Structure 1
Amino acid sequence: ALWQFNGMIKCKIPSSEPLLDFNNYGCYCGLGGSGTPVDDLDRCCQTHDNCYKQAKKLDSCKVLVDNPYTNNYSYSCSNNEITCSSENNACEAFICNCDRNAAICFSKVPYNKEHKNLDKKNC
């Protein structure tokens, strides 16, 4: 699963989408990439990955399905805010906090269109 993430960034920023702006940017935003960041926005993505790791260390996550990807959580948007099914257990709630915390950073940090599509040779 993944399309759910874009939704989190769509709620915080309805006037702009990630796949149509923050797509393939910095060395952490997007899906892969790696190495020194390029701006404050890239730092947010670099942290998104760090959150999926913390989720694996969690006990509940340790005995679930050894895979924070197939784990799809339910959520919703409203008042420029993200809504996540409270039923989400410890792991389900942590995975949502990771995607939600990522959309909040993009809206709290600036975005350089020039740093878009950076060269891994700089990372």
Structure 2
Amino acid sequence: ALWQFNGMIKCKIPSSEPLLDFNNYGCYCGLGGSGTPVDDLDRCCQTHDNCYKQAKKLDSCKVLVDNPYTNNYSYSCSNNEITCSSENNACEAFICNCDRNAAICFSKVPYNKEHKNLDKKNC
């Protein structure tokens, strides 16, 4: 879920607007992604893009015809930790977990200014 992923990263990184700060970073953070991750942040993005690919092959996901970016799930942020809810259907829960791991990855890795708006010439 885009609105929930944005919220998740803000839970971990309260000073950020994730849709601005983390969009179009490296080869993978943003729409698509190809090539070799340029750093560990971009590698968090590659893992999350693979988590969505895997979510897409799941039998449960084959119904909710809301790409993982508009498929909404339920979670909490409290005390800056994210909890995915037991209320989620199997597809929703799998996606909530991809998002949670990515938000956590993003908070633990360097941010490299020079890889933001990375020109795709060698992704």
TM-score tier after normalising by the smaller chain length: 0.7 to 0.9
CA distances 1:42-67 after superposition (whole Å, capped 9, x unpaired):
00011111111111222222344484
Classify the secondary structure of the residue corresponding to 2:82: strand
Structure 2 equivalent of residue 55 of structure 1: 55
4+ long deviations beyond 6 Å: none
> Do the aligned residues in 1 keep the contact of 2:74 with 2:87 (CA within 8 Å)?
no
Runs (5+) with no aligned partner, structure 2: none
> Do the aligned residues in 2 keep the contact of 1:56 with 1:66 (CA within 8 Å)?
no
> Do the aligned residues in 1 keep the contact of 2:33 with 2:46 (CA within 8 Å)?
no
Classify the secondary structure of the residue corresponding to 2:83: strand
Shift, 1:77, TM fit: 0.8
> Do the aligned residues in 1 keep the contact of 2:12 with 2:81 (CA within 8 Å)?
yes
Q: How many residues align?
A: 123
| Identity level (%) | 100
CA RMSD, Structure 1 to Structure 2 (Å):
1.9
Classify the secondary structure of the residue corresponding to 2:104: helix
Distance in 2 (alpha carbons) for counterparts of 1:34 and 1:4: 25
